[PDB]
A paper describes a structure:
To gain insights into the molecular mechanisms that govern the metalloreductase activity of STEAP proteins, we determine structures of human STEAP4 using single-particle cryo-EM. The trimeric arrangement observed in the cryo-EM structures is formed by interactions in STEAP protomers in both the OxRD and TMD layers, with a phospholipid molecule packed in between the TMDs of adjacent enzyme subunits, indicating that lipids stabilize the trimer.
We then determined structures of STEAP4EM in the presence of NADPH and FAD (cofactor-bound state) and in the presence of NADP+, FAD, and Fe3+-NTA (cofactor/substrate-bound state) using single-particle cryo-EM. We argue that the difference in resolution is mainly caused by microscope type (200 kV FEI Arctica vs. 300 kV FEI Krios) and not by sample quality. The addition of cofactors NADPH and FAD, combined with lowering the pH from 8.0 to 5.5, strongly stabilized STEAP4EM and led to an increase in melting temperature of 11 °C (from 45.3 to 56.3 °C). Cryo-EM structures of STEAP4 in cofactor-bound and cofactor/substrate-bound states revealed the binding of FAD and heme molecules to the TMD of each protomer. At the intracellular side of the TMD cavity formed by helices h2–h5, we found density for an FAD molecule, which is axially anchored in the membrane through its tricyclic flavin ring. The adenine base stacks with W140 of a domain-swapped OxRD, indicating that FAD bridges the intracellular and TM domains of adjacent STEAP4 subunits. Although purified STEAP4EM displays catalytic activity, the nicotinamide ring of NADPH does not stack to a flavin ring in the observed structures; the closest flavin ring atom resides at ~18-Å distance in the adjacent STEAP4 TMD subunit.
Author numbering:
A (entry chain A), B (entry chain B), C (entry chain C): 19 to 454
C-alpha cells in the first residue's frame, strides 16, 4: 500500500486526505503543530514537516504561495521527492512567475508536478464532482509525472496531461476566469439592446401618446422585445462574418499572408464563436415570441375587432394574392434561415467539433454560414417590402427601426460578392500559398 | 508480428479473434477439444490450453467465472504471462469479490488486466461500434497495462485507463445497469403524473358531467396533458434546489461542515442532475402543447362562436388594457423562464461540462438556477392573477389544480431569501472554511 | 532546450516553425538553398539537408510524396532518427501504400511516426484551431512515439494515439473526405424530395388551374414544403428500421449468424445513423412550418371568410365532438412522436453516446425507436381518418399524396409484429448464441 504525505492540514488537506483514506493510501499529514490537530480523519497520523517527509515519496503542498518560506529549511530532506504544487492565486497576473516555477527554484533537488488546482474541496467531500472532473497535470520529469497520474485515476477523476512545466502559467489562469471570451459579446449586445430599446419606445409608446393620444404602453412586454431581439440577433450575426471580409481585403493591400493582423482584429478573430452563440440566443427568443403571437390578448382582440367590423359593414377582403406570397415568403425564408442557424450551433459543441475534420467544418461554418446570413437578410427584406419604405412610415424624422439593422449585413453581402468574383478570387487562391 | 492467445472459443472468442485476423495478430485459440472446432476463422489454429499458452505472451480468457477451475491445473505455465480478464456477471453483487480479484488469487504468478468487458461481440462482428467505443482498462502492473492498451488502439477502439485493480469492482457494475440514477426521478414523476391526471379529470370532465351535463371529454387529449406536464415540470424543478436549501440549514444546526449528511439527503444530492433533465423534458412538452394551441379544433371553434356572438349582438369588447398587460406578462415571463431552462440543459452535456471550470459552472447552475425558478414561478403567479383565487373557482371543495403545485416552489423561494440575508449569509461564509 | 529540425521551408514549414519559436524549441530549417530563404522567422537558422539533420533528433518532413527521392542520398545520416511524416495526398487511393509505409522502406534505419497531417497551416498561424484540435499519431516504435506526443502537447494541441503503423492508411483518408457517409441519405432524400414536389404540384396548383380555374399558386411557399418534408421525414425514418427487419429475417433462412450479410445491406447497416439524423432535420422543419400556420395570410384570410359567412348566414356549427377527438388526437400523437424523435437525436451526440453502455443505448435506440415509429405512423393515420380515403379525394387517378408514404412504415410494423411473436422470437433467442 502506498504512502502519500500532505503538507498543510487546512481546507483542502482535510478533504483530499479523507478521499484517500477511502481509496487506500497511507496518508501522513504534516502541520505546524502535531500536538493539536482537532479535525482529522481516523486512520491518518499527523507528524512534523521534517518527520512526515521522511516517509512518503509523494508530497502534496496544500499551502498558499506566501507561506513557502519554511521549505528552504528542509531542502536536504526533499532530495528526489515528487512535489505536487496545487496552489492558486487570488487574481490573474499577481506574480511574474507561476507557483510551480517559483516552487522549483526554492527546491531544485525535487521534481515539481502541477496538479489538482482545478477541483474544489467541497466537490471532494460531497462527491458531486461535476464540473471538477478533469485534473490538469504538467511537469518536466515524465516518470514522476506518470506516478501522479496513477493517483488521480484512483480518486475517480480524469487526468489530462498538459505537457512541460511551461504550461503551468496557463493552468493557473484557468480556474480564476469567469467567461473571459464572452465579455466582448455581452457588452456589445447590451449596448445594442439598451439603445434599440429606447429607440423603439420613442416610436411605439411615445408617438401614440403625442398624437392620437392613447395608452398603448403594453408594447414593451412582448412587441418591443420582439423588435430588439432579432435585430440584435441579425447584427451580431453580421458581425461574425465581418472580420472574414476585412482580413480578406487586408491580405490584398499587403499582398502576402505572413504579416500579423493589427491586434484589434485579432481578438475579434478569436471572438467569432463567442458572438455566434450569442446571436443564437437572441434568435431563439425571436422564435419563441413569434410562435406565441396567436395567444396574446392584443392579437386576439385586434382579430376580433377587424372581423366584426367586416361583419357589420358588408364590405369584404378580396384575397389579394400578392400579399399571399409575401406573408408566406419571409416566414419560409425565416424557417430555413433558422434551421441552419441551429445547425451551426450543434456544430459548435466541443464533442461534435472534435469528430469533424476542418474541411467539413469549413463547409458548415463558412459555406453554409453565409447561406444563413442570406436567408436571415431576405427574411427582413421581404418583411420590409410590406412596409415598402414609404414617407408615411417614419414618425418624426426616424425610420421603422429595422432598417438601422440592415446597414451591417448588406455591407457584408456586397463586399463578399466582390470577393467571389474571379478577378479577385483567383488572386485569393495564389495568395493562400505564397505571393509577392 | 505479435501472437495473441484466446482461451474459450465461444461467442466472444470467435468475434474477438476474427477482428484480430483483420488487424494482423497471430491468433492462437485454445479450447477443450482441438479436434472438433467447426466455426473458426481461416488463419488461426486451435490448440490445447497447455499448448496455446506456450506461444503467446498475452492470454485472453473468454470464459465465465464458474469455469475458472482448470486454470489451477496449469499455473506453472502462466508464470509471468499477461492475463486479460474480460468476464461479466449475471447481476450486481453476485459475489463478494470481482472477477479480476478472484482471478489473481487463482494464478498469483501472472499479471491481471481487466479489459474488454464493456463492448459486445455483435458490435465487433457488425462493426457498428457506436456506444461500445471506449474500453476500460485497470490493473496493477503498469508495463503490462500499456501492452494491452497497444492492442486496443489497433482494434479501432479507445482505451480509457481506470487506475489500479481496486477499480475492477466498479467496472463490472458498469455494463449491467440500465439507468441507475434515473430510477428516482422516473418513479417520482410517474406517481405525480398519475395523481395529477386523476385530479384534473375530476375537475374537467366529471364536473361538466354532473352539472350542466355535456360531454366535454376531449380535454384529456391535449388540455389535461397541458396541465399535468408543467406542474410536473415545476415541482421537479423546485425539488432540485430543495436539498441545497435543506443542507444549508442543516449546516447551521451543526455549526460545521465536517459531519456527514444523513444518507437520505445524500442520494438526493446525487440525483440533482437526474431531476433537472426530467424537468426539462416536461417543460419542453408544455412548450409544444402551448405553441400548437391555435391549431386545435376546440380553439378554432370557440374563437368562432365568441366572434359571431359579438357579431350578431352589437355589443363589443372595450379592450381592457389591464388584461393586455397580464396576457402579455406571463408569456414573456415564460419565454425568459424557458430560455434559461434550456441553457441549464446545454450546460449539462458531458462535453460542455468538461470545458468549464467550477466557478462558471456554479454561476450557471446556481446563480442562474434560481433565476429560472423565479421566472417559472412568476409565469404561473401572473396566470394565477387572471383566476384571482376566487370562491367561484373550486368545483366541489378543491382548487384550480395549479396552486397545489405552488406549495413547493414558494417554500424554497422564501427560505432561500432568508439565506441571502446578511444576518445568516455572513455566518454561511465563515462556516464554509471552518467554524465551531 | 530541445532542437527540432524541419525539412522543407514551404507553406507548412514556416507555420509549424513559427509556432515552435513561440513554444521554446531550437528550430533548424533545412531547404534546398540555405543562401536564399526570404520568408523565415527570427530565431531559426536555415542549413543544408545533410547539415540540419546532424543537429536534432526529431526530423519533420514537410514535403510532398513525389519529392522523397533525395532522402536515399542521406540515409546514413538518418540512422536512429525520429522521422515525422506529415504528408497528405491529392485524392483517395492514389497509391497502393500510404506515405509512412513508403517512407519507412526508403529509410529503414529510422523510426517513422505519422502525425500532424490533420491540422492546417492557417490554423497554426491564426491560432483559430477549432476543428483542427486533435492530432492523430501512429507508429511502431513506442518510445519514439511518446517523444512526438511530448511535442504536440506543447503546441496546445491534443494527441490521439492510433496504434501501430498499419493504421496510417486510414489516417490519410481522414482529412480528404467531405461527409462520406452522408452521401447516401442526401441523394436518397433529394430524389424523394424532388419526386414528391412534382407530385404535389400536380395535385395542388395544376388541378385548380384545369378545373375551377383560379391561381392558387402560392401553395409551393409553405404548404407544399409542409407536405414534402414530413413524408420525407417519415419514409427516411422507416428506412432506418428496415435493415433491422430484413437481417432478422435473413438470419432465419440461414439458421445461423456467422455468415456475412450481402454487402449491399452492409453499407445500409452503417448508414443507419446517417439516415436518422437526416430524418430529424426534415421533421424539425415539419414542426416549424406547422407551428407558424396561424401567422400565414392564407390561414388568416380563410378563417375570416368562414366566420363572416357564418356571421351573415345565421346557420352555425353544432360542435361535432367526434371531430374534437381527431383534431386533438393526431396532434397529441405528433408531439409524443416528436419528443422521442428529439431524444434519439440527443443520444446521437458523440459525447452522450460515450457515456452510456450498450444496453441502455439499445433501449433508447431500439426499444424506444419503434415507439417513435408507431406514434409517427399514428400521427398520419388519424389525420388520414379525416380524409377517410374516399373516392371524392383523388384528383385524376392519383391519391392524396401521403398514402404513398405509408407503404414503407406499415410494412415494417407488420413484419416487426411477426418477429415479436413467440413462435419466432424464441427462435431468435437461441440463434443469437449459436444454432444450426
Ligand atoms: C451559431 C454560430 C456558431 C459558430 N461557431 C463557431 C465555432 O465553434 N468556432 C469558430 O471558429 N467559429 C464559429 N462561428 C463563427 C464562424 O463560423 C466562423 O467565421 C467560421 O469558423 C469561419 O468563417 P469565415 O468566413 O471567417 O471563414 P475563414 O476561413 O475563417 O475566413 C476567411 C478568411 O480567412 C483567411 N483564411 C482562411 N483559410 C485560409 C488559408 N488556408 N490560408 C490563408 N488564409 C486563409 C483568409 O483571409 C480568408 O479570406 C460560429 C458562428 C455562428 C453564427
Ligand atoms: C436543467 C438542469 C440541469 C442540471 N444539470 C446539472 C448537472 O449537470 N450537474 C449537477 O450537479 N446539477 C445539475 N442540476 C442541478 C442544479 O444545477 C444543482 O443544484 C447545481 O449544481 C448547484 O445548485 P445548488 O443551489 O444546490 O448549489 P450548491 O452549491 O450545490 O448548494 C448550495 C449548498 O452547498 C453547500 N456548499 C456549496 N459549496 C460549498 C463550499 N465551497 N463549501 C461548503 N459547502 C458548500 C452549502 O451547504 C451550500 O448552502 C441541474 C438542474 C437543472 C434544472
Ligand atoms: C434520430 C435517430 C438517431 C439515430 N442515431 C443512431 C446512432 O447514433 N447510432 C446508430 O447506430 N444508429 C442510430 N440510429 C439508427 C437506429 O437507432 C438503429 O437501428 C439502432 O442503433 C438499432 O436499431 P435496430 O432495430 O436495428 O436494432 P439492432 O439490434 O441493431 O437490430 C436488430 C437485429 O440486429 C441483430 N442483432 C442485434 N443484436 C444482436 C446480437 N446480440 N446477436 C446477434 N444478432 C444481433 C439481429 O439480426 C437483430 O434482429 C438513429 C436513428 C434515428 C431515427
Ligand atoms: N476550495 C479550496 O479552498 C481550494 C481548492 C483547491 C486548491 N486550493 C489551494 O489550497 C491551498 C490552501 O488553501 P486552503 O483553501 O486549503 O486554506 P488553508 O489550508 O486552511 O490555509 C493555508 C494552510 O497553510 C498552513 N500553514 C502553515 N504555515 C502557515 C502560516 N504561517 N500561515 C498560514 N497558514 C499556514 C496552515 O495549516 P498548518 O499550519 O497546520 O500547516 C493553513 O491551513 C491554496 O493554495 C489553494 O489555492 C484551495
Ligand atoms: N456479447 C457477449 O456475449 C459478451 C460480451 C463481452 C464479454 N462477454 C463475456 O465472455 C465470456 C464468455 O461468455 P460468452 O458469451 O462468449 O459465451 P461462450 O464463450 O460461448 O461460453 C463460455 C465458454 O466457455 C468454454 N468452456 C470451457 N470449459 C467449459 C465448461 N466446462 N463449461 C462451459 N463452457 C466451457 C466454452 O468453450 P470451449 O469449451 O471450447 O473452451 C464456452 O464457449 C463471459 O464472461 C462474458 O461476460 C460476453
Ligand atoms: N495547409 C497545408 O498546406 C498543409 C497542411 C498540413 C500538411 N500539409 C502537407 O505539407 C506538405 C508540404 O506541402 P505544402 O502545402 O506545405 O507546400 P510547400 O511546402 O510550399 O511545397 C513543398 C516543398 O517541398 C520543398 N522542396 C524540396 N525539393 C523540392 C522539389 N524538387 N520540388 C518541389 N518542392 C521541393 C520545397 O521547399 P524547399 O525547396 O526549400 O526545400 C517546397 O516548399 C504536403 O505533404 C502537405 O500534405 C500541408
Ligand atoms: C422561426 C423562424 C422565424 C419566424 C417565424 C420569424 C417570423 C418573423 C415575423 C413574423 C416577423 C415580423 C414580426 C412583426 O410583425 O413585428 C419577424 C421579424 C423579424 N425577424 Fe424573424 N422570424 C424567424 C426567424 C428569424 C431569424 C432566424 C432572424 C435572423 C436572426 C430573424 C430576423 C428578423 C428580423 C430582423 C425581423 C424584423 C424585426 C422588426 O422589424 O421588428 N427572424 N420575424
Ligand atoms: C415557451 C414558454 C412558455 C409559454 C408560452 C407558456 C405558456 C403558458 C400558457 C399559455 C399557460 C396557460 C395554459 C392554459 O391556458 O391552460 C401556461 C401555464 C403554465 N405554465 Fe407555462 N409557458 C411556458 C413555459 C413554462 C415554463 C418554463 C414553466 C415552468 C416549468 C411553465 C409552467 C407553467 C405552469 C405551471 C402553468 C400552469 C398550468 C395550469 O394551471 O394548467 N411554463 N403556460
Ligand atoms: C410538433 C409535432 C407535430 C405536429 C404539431 C404535427 C402537426 C401536423 C399537422 C397539423 C399536419 C397536417 C398538416 C396539414 O393540415 O396539411 C401534419 C401532417 C403530417 N405530419 Fe405532422 N406534426 C408533428 C410531428 C410530426 C412528426 C414527428 C412526423 C413524423 C415524421 C409527422 C409526420 C406528418 C405527416 C407524414 C403528415 C402528413 C403530411 C401531409 O399529408 O400533407 N409529423 N402534422
Ligand atoms: C450566459 C451564457 C453562458 C453560456 C455558456 C456556454 O454555453 O458556453 C460554455 C462553453 C464555451 O466555452 P469556451 O469554448 O471556452 O469559450 O461551451 C461551448 O462551447 C458552447 C457550446 C454550446 C452550443 C449550443
Ligand atoms: C428516458 C430518458 C433517457 C435519457 C438518457 C440521457 O439523455 O442521459 C444519458 C446521460 C446521463 O447519464 P449519467 O450522467 O451517467 O447519469 O447523458 C447526460 O448526461 C444527459 C445529457 C443530456 C442533456 C441534454
Ligand atoms: C448538412 C448536414 C451536416 C451535418 C453534420 C453533422 O452534424 O454531423 C457531424 C458528425 C457526424 O459525423 P460521423 O459520426 O463521422 O458520421 O457528428 C454527429 O455525430 C452528429 C451529431 C448531431 C446530433 C444532433
Ligand atoms: C375597433 O377599434 C377602433 C379603434 O381602432 C374603435 O374605435 C372601435 O370601437 C373598435 N370596434 C369595436 C370595438 O367593435
Ligand atoms: C369566400 O370565398 C368564396 C370562394 O371560396 C368567395 O366566392 C366569397 O366571396 C368569399 N366570401 C367573402 C369574401 O365574404
Ligand atoms: C355558442 O356556444 C353556446 C354554448 O356555450 C351555444 O349554446 C351557442 O349555440 C353557440 N353559438 C353558436 C353556435 O352560434
Amino acid at each position: 500500500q502506498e504512502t502519500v504525505c500532505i503538507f498543510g492540514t487546512g481546507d483542502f488537506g482535510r478533504s483530499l486526505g479523507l478521499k484517500m483514506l477511502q481509496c487506500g493510501y497511507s496518508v501522513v499529514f504534516g502541520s505546524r503543530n502535531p500536538q493539536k490537530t482537532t479535525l482529522l480523519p481516523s486512520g491518518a497520523e499527523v507528524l512534523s514537516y521534517s518527520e512526515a517527509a521522511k516517509k512518503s515519496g509523494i508530497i502534496i503542498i496544500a499551502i498558499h504561495r506566501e507561506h513557502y518560506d519554511f521549505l528552504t529549511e528542509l531542502t536536504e530532506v526533499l532530495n528526489g521527492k515528487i512535489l505536487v504544487d496545487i496552489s492558486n492565486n487570488l487574481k490573474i497576473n499577481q506574480y511574474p512567475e507561476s507557483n510551480a516555477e517559483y516552487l522549483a527554484h526554492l527546491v531544485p533537488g525535487a521534481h515539481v508536478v502541477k496538479a489538482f488546482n482545478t477541483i474544489s474541496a467541497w466537490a471532494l467531500q460531497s462527491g458531486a464532482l461535476d464540473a471538477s472532473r478533469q485534473v490538469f497535470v504538467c511537469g518536466n520529469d515524465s516518470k514522476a509525472k506518470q506516478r501522479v497520474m496513477d493517483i488521480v485515476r484512483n480518486l475517480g477523476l480524469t487526468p489530462m496531461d498538459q505537457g512541460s512545466l511551461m504550461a503551468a502559467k496557463e493552468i493557473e489562469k484557468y480556474p480564476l476566469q469567469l467567461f473571459p471570451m464572452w465579455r466582448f459579446p455581452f457588452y456589445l449586445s447590451a449596448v445594442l439592446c439598451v439603445f434599440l430599446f429606447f429607440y423603439c419606445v420613442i416610436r411605439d409608446v411615445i408617438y401614440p401618446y403625442v398624437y392620437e393620444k392613447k395608452d398603448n404602453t403594453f408594447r414593451m412586454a412582448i412587441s418591443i422585445p420582439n423588435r430588439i431581439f432579432p435585430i440584435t440577433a441579425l447584427t451580431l450575426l453580421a458581425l461574425v462574418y465581418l472580420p472574414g471580409v476585412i482580413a480578406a481585403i487586408l491580405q490584398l493591400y499587403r499582398g502576402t499572408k505572413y504579416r500579423r493582423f493589427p491586434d484589434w482584429l485579432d481578438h475579434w478573430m478569436l471572438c467569432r464563436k463567442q458572438l455566434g452563440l450569442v446571436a443564437l440566443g437572441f434568435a431563439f427568443l425571436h422564435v419563441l415570441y413569434t410562435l406565441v403571437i396567436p395567444i396574446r390578448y392584443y392579437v386576439r382582440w385586434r382579430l376580433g375587432n377587424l372581423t366584426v367590423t367586416q361583419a357589420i359593414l358588408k364590405k369584404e377582403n378580396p384575397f389579394s394574392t400578392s400579399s399571399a406570397w409575401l406573408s408566406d415568403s419571409y416566414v419560409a425564408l425565416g424557417i430555413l434561415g433558422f434551421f441552419l442557424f441551429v445547425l451551426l450551433g450543434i456544430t459548435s459543441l466541443p464533442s461534435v467539433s472534435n469528430a469533424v475534420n476542418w474541411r467539413e467544418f469549413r463547409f458548415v461554418q463558412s459555406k453554409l454560414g453565409y447561406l444563413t446570413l442570406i436567408l436571415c437578410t431576405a427574411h427582413t427584406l421581404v418583411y420590409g417590402g410590406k412596409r415598402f419604405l414609404s414617407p408615411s412610415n417614419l414618425r418624426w424624422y426616424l425610420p421603422a427601426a429595422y432598417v438601422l439593422g440592415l446597414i451591417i449585413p448588406c455591407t457584408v453581402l456586397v463586399i463578399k460578392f466582390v470577393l467571389i468574383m474571379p478577378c479577385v478570387d483567383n488572386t485569393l487562391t495564389r495568395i493562400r500559398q505564397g505571393w509577392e
